[PDB]
Amino acid sequence: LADLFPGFGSEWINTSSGRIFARVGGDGPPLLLLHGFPQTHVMWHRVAPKLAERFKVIVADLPGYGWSDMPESDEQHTPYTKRAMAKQLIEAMEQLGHVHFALAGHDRGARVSYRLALDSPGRLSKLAVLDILPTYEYWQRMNRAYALKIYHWSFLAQPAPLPENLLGGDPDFYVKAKLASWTRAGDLSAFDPRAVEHYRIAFADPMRRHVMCEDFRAGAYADFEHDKIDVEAGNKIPVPMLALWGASGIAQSAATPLDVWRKWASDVQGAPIESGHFLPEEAPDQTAEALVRFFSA
Amino acid sequence: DLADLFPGFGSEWINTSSGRIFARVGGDGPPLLLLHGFPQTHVMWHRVAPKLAERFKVIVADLPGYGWSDMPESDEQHTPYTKRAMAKQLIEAMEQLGHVHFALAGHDRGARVSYRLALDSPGRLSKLAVLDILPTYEYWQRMNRAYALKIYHWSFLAQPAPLPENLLGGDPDFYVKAKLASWTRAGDLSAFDPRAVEHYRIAFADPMRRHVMCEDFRAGAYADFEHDKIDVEAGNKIPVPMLALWGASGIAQSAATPLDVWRKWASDVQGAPIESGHFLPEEAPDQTAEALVRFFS
Ligand SMILES: [Cl-]
Ligand SMILES: [Cl-]
C-alpha cells in the first residue's frame, strides 16, 4: 500500500474504545479530517498537503475503519453510532492534547462531525460537513424516488448476516462499483489508483465490511433517533459551520442543502462544487481552498 | 429428484406468443387459475390445491419467466415482466385451454399480475382473490423509513443491472432461504415442506431465473407503478367480485386495514385476516383453503 501523505507522521492513538490510526502533518491550529464509506483516511490525500501549510492536520481512520481497531458491536450497534464515534475521537484528540479543534468530515465522518457538534459543541472551533444532510433529513425525505436513488441505506441496514453474506461473494466489484457510481462521471477516473487500492484492501476484510454494515444499522436506528430528539427539540449547532456539497452528489438529491442546514445550525454558510460525492478527490483544489479559507477566517 | 407434490394433477406446457407457461392441472368443474409470487414457484399451492380441486378445475401456473415457464427476453422498460404483460401472456395461456372466463387467486407477485389483469381485462374474471398484498402504487406511496427498511428488496432488486445479480450469485441458497423465512410467523423455515423449499432453491440457483426476478422488481418500481397511478388518477375500480386475504403478521399493522385499502381499488370486495405470516397457503393451509373454497364456490 502506498504512502499518500509525504512527510506526514503516523499515530496509533489509544482510547477506551480502541486505537485510532491517523496520519499527522503540518503545524498551526489543530484540524481533524474524517472520511466516510467506503473509504479510509487516504481520501484526504489530495487536500491534506495544502491544509498542512496552515494547520496541524490529523487525518484519522474512523472507529472500525482502515487501520483503527474494530470494537465488538452490540444489539444497538452502539460503537458505530455517530454519538459513540464522536466520543471516541474526542478521547483520541485529548491524547494529542487537543481539547478544542477544527473539524471537517465527509460522508459518515461528516455525520460523526455534526453529531459531535450537537453533543459537545465546546470541543469545536469550527465545523465543515461535506456532501451530507443530517441522517434525520435523509430518512424524513424517504419516498419511492429516494428509496430507489439511495438504496444502500436500507440494504446495508438489514439484519446481519444478510448484507455481509451478499457482499462476501465478490467484494471488489461492490466497492469499485460504489466508488464509481457516486462520482460525477460515473467511473473511477477521479481517484488515484493507489487510493482505490487502499479502499479495496479495507473492503476485502469481512470484519471491516461488518463494521460498515453496523455503521449503516446505526444510521437506520440509534443515529436517526438521536437526530430526531434534536430536531424535535429545536436544538441547533452553535459552532460556526460550513456545508460543502457536490452538484451531482448524494446530499443535493431533492433538497437545497444550505436551507436544510440552516434548520440544524445557527451560523452556517455553504456552497456547491461541481463534483459528485467525493469532493476531496473529484475537486481537490476547490475543496482545499474552501476549507483553508473557512478555517482561516 | 424434485418431489411431485400435486397428487392427481397433470403437467402441461401451454404455448403463448411470449413463450411456454408451465402448469399443474387437476380437478374438474369451473376453471380456477392459481398464481405464485417471489421467491417461489407454482409448488407453493401444494397444500391448498387439492382441496380446491375437489370443486374446481385447478390450473397451478408458473409465472412468465419463473419456475419452468420460459423466460421471454426483456428490454429497457422490463416489458415482459410488467404485470400488464404477464397478465396478457397468462390470458393467452388460458385461451389455449379454452378458458376465457375464469376464477383467479394470486399471492405476492402473482397477486399483482392478478389485480392488474382485473383492471385491464375484467371480463376475463368471474371472481378474484389476492393474498397478503396491497396494490403496488399503495406500497410505494407508503415508502417511508419504516417501509424502506421492511420492504428493502423492492428497492435493492430494482437497482440497475448488474448490481443485484452480481450480489445474488455469491450465495443464492442463503438469500432465497432468508426471503422465505423472514416473513413467516416463526421466522424460520419450519412452515414450509422441505421438498417445496428445494423447488424454490433449485429455481433460485439459476442466474437466468434470478435475473427475471430482478426484472420483475424493476418493472414493479417503474412501469407497474405508472400503470397503477393511471388507474388511481382515473378513479378506476375493479368490478370483479373480490376477496382480499392477508396475514395477521404479514402486512404491517396500521389504523387502516388492508380491506380499507382494497375498498378504494374495488367496488365489490370482502376480506379477512388469517393467522399467518406472509406465506398464507403454506403457513395456514387449512384456513386459506377454507376461505378460498367458500369464496369461489
Ligand atoms: Cl453518508
Ligand atoms: Cl445525505
Side-chain angles (χ1 to χ4, degrees), chain A, chain B residues 2-72 74-184 186-252 254-297:
Chain A
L1 293 175
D3 179 354
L4 298 171
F5 299 86
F8 277 56
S10 296
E11 302 269 8
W12 218 1
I13 306 169
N14 291 292
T15 77
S16 66
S17 288
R19 284 167 303 185
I20 294 296
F21 180 72
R23 298 301 295 278
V24 179
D27 48 85
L31 168 64
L32 179 57
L33 300 181
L34 300 180
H35 71 89
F37 170 91
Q39 303 195 295
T40 70
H41 74 279
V42 303
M43 67 153 273
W44 300 101
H45 75 105
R46 296 194 65 194
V47 301
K50 171 93 184 310
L51 288 166
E53 297 179 349
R54 321 264 299 256
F55 306 98
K56 183 71 166 197
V57 181
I58 300 126
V59 200
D61 282 333
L62 292 177
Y65 280 81
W67 290 357
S68 294
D69 285 336
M70 294 176 281
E72 189 180 358
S73 199
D74 61 36
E75 296 89 331
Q76 287 69 56
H77 325 295
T78 306
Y80 301 107
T81 63
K82 311 306 161 286
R83 170 161 291 153
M85 294 186 169
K87 289 175 181 172
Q88 181 173 3
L89 285 156
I90 286 169
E91 280 184 53
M93 286 297 270
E94 283 219 2
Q95 284 293 304
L96 304 182
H98 311 308
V99 301
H100 188 70
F101 49 91
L103 174 56
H106 177 257
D107 188 273
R108 309 318 281 184
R111 306 187 181 285
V112 175
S113 298
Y114 81 75
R115 174 49 54 194
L116 202 161
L118 286 159
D119 290 355
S120 304
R123 291 289 164 168
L124 303 180
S125 52
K126 282 174 181 166
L127 163 68
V129 295
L130 278 63
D131 206 50
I132 65 144
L133 310 180
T135 288
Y136 171 90
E137 296 291 350
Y138 166 101
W139 287 118
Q140 285 297 115
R141 267 158 185 77
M142 187 46 69
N143 60 13
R144 165 179 164 268
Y146 269 95
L148 285 170
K149 256 276 184 288
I150 323 168
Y151 84 98
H152 65 291
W153 280 47
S154 299
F155 169 63
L156 297 174
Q158 293 303 303
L162 183 131
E164 288 90 339
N165 283 354
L166 284 158
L167 297 174
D170 187 0
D172 291 0
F173 185 89
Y174 189 78
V175 63
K176 290 188 183 192
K178 278 294 182 290
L179 292 164
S181 76
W182 296 344
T183 62
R184 170 78 183 86
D187 55 30
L188 299 169
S189 73
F191 305 104
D192 190 307
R194 300 171 300 154
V196 177
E197 183 61 15
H198 275 266
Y199 314 142
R200 194 198 63 77
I201 280 295
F203 202 83
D205 185 337
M207 297 185 74
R208 299 284 169 188
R209 298 195 295 271
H210 174 63
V211 163
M212 293 166 207
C213 295
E214 292 296 296
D215 181 349
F216 280 90
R217 294 177 180 119
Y221 292 109
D223 293 343
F224 170 77
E225 291 298 336
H226 299 167
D227 281 15
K228 183 172 182 286
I229 279 168
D230 285 307
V231 73
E232 293 181 332
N235 301 333
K236 293 188 174 201
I237 292 157
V239 184
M241 203 172 168
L242 171 73
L244 295 175
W245 63 98
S248 282
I250 302 171
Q252 59 77 40
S253 204
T256 324
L258 195 48
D259 287 308
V260 175
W261 276 110
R262 282 166 176 155
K263 158 212 260 204
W264 285 80
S266 57
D267 178 3
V268 52
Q269 52 182 286
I273 295 271
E274 170 62 358
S275 178
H277 183 56
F278 303 101
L279 277 47
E281 289 167 293
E282 295 185 66
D285 301 319
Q286 289 164 269
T287 300
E289 176 166 327
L291 291 178
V292 164
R293 293 175 74 174
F294 171 70
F295 288 126
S296 293
Chain B
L2 288 172
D4 172 24
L5 300 166
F6 292 86
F9 281 63
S11 295
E12 288 283 318
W13 302 85
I14 309 165
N15 295 312
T16 81
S17 62
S18 291
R20 289 176 303 158
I21 296 298
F22 178 76
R24 300 296 303 272
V25 180
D28 48 82
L32 168 65
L33 177 63
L34 301 179
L35 298 183
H36 69 89
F38 172 88
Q40 307 191 289
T41 69
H42 73 277
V43 313
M44 61 145 301
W45 298 102
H46 75 106
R47 316 281 311 277
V48 306
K51 156 81 142 157
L52 289 161
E54 295 179 7
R55 306 175 79 154
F56 308 98
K57 173 188 167 175
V58 176
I59 302 132
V60 202
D62 287 334
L63 292 177
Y66 279 80
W68 294 350
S69 289
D70 290 338
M71 297 171 282
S74 198
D75 58 34
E76 293 195 348
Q77 291 72 30
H78 324 295
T79 305
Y81 300 110
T82 65
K83 308 306 159 286
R84 170 160 292 154
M86 286 187 178
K88 288 178 183 169
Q89 185 175 355
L90 282 157
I91 282 163
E92 283 189 43
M94 288 293 278
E95 286 208 344
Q96 293 277 321
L97 310 186
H99 308 317
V100 295
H101 191 71
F102 49 93
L104 173 60
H107 176 256
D108 191 272
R109 311 309 286 179
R112 306 185 184 284
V113 178
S114 294
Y115 80 76
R116 174 46 57 195
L117 205 160
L119 285 164
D120 286 359
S121 302
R124 299 283 172 171
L125 297 188
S126 52
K127 282 166 181 171
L128 166 67
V130 290
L131 282 64
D132 206 54
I133 69 148
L134 306 186
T136 286
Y137 174 89
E138 292 302 333
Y139 257 26
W140 285 119
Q141 289 294 105
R142 292 183 170 203
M143 200 62 62
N144 63 5
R145 166 176 165 271
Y147 264 66
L149 292 165
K150 192 193 175 174
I151 323 288
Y152 89 95
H153 74 286
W154 276 37
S155 298
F156 166 62
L157 302 169
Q159 289 307 291
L163 183 148
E165 288 92 343
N166 165 268
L167 281 169
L168 295 174
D171 189 351
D173 295 358
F174 167 89
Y175 194 78
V176 66
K177 285 183 173 183
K179 288 295 174 281
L180 290 168
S182 66
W183 287 355
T184 65
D188 62 20
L189 290 174
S190 59
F192 304 96
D193 194 300
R195 298 162 296 167
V197 174
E198 180 67 8
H199 273 265
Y200 314 139
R201 187 196 65 81
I202 291 283
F204 201 82
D206 182 346
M208 294 188 67
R209 300 287 173 183
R210 297 194 297 272
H211 174 64
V212 166
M213 298 172 197
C214 292
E215 290 295 290
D216 179 351
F217 288 97
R218 287 172 190 128
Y222 291 104
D224 293 337
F225 167 78
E226 297 300 343
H227 295 168
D228 279 18
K229 186 165 175 280
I230 282 146
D231 288 304
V232 167
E233 291 173 343
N236 293 337
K237 289 200 180 188
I238 291 154
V240 178
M242 201 173 172
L243 175 74
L245 297 179
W246 67 91
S249 49
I251 297 167
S254 152
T257 72
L259 185 48
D260 296 319
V261 174
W262 277 107
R263 290 246 167 81
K264 303 179 212 283
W265 281 84
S267 52
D268 179 8
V269 57
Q270 58 193 263
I274 299 272
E275 308 166 62
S276 172
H278 185 54
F279 297 90
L280 271 63
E282 286 163 297
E283 294 181 64
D286 297 332
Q287 311 98 286
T288 302
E290 178 70 27
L292 291 180
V293 162
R294 194 177 63 219
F295 177 66
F296 287 124
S297 193

